[PDB]
């Protein structure tokens, strides 16, 4: 058990904050004070990257434990067969439990390679 929704609430504050930045970059695009308003334009847009590259880790990191939720409740129905004579049918969908859990796995195996690959053009 983990309430692991804090990541949620973030999630919210950077939409709001972008939907925001979107209309206040609008009300920006409406000559001392050209070349200030020429500065300010380019600091909303590293600030919409930032809030997009966090909010990009936090969707993997949702979507992470989206399949890590829907990969208990079927470990649950694997160990229910083999946890003796069955059905053959009842070895069959055994059988498409497996496939669907080796296609977490190599979802799993692309996340992290997202948040590596991530990571790595960060250098």
Known sequence: ???????????????????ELEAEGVKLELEQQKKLWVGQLLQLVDKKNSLVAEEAELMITVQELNLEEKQWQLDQELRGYMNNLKTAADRQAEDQVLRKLVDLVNQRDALIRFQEERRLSEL
């Open 1 to 19: 058990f983990c309430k692991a929704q804090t990541i949620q609430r973030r999630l919210n504050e950077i939409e709001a904050a972008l939907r």
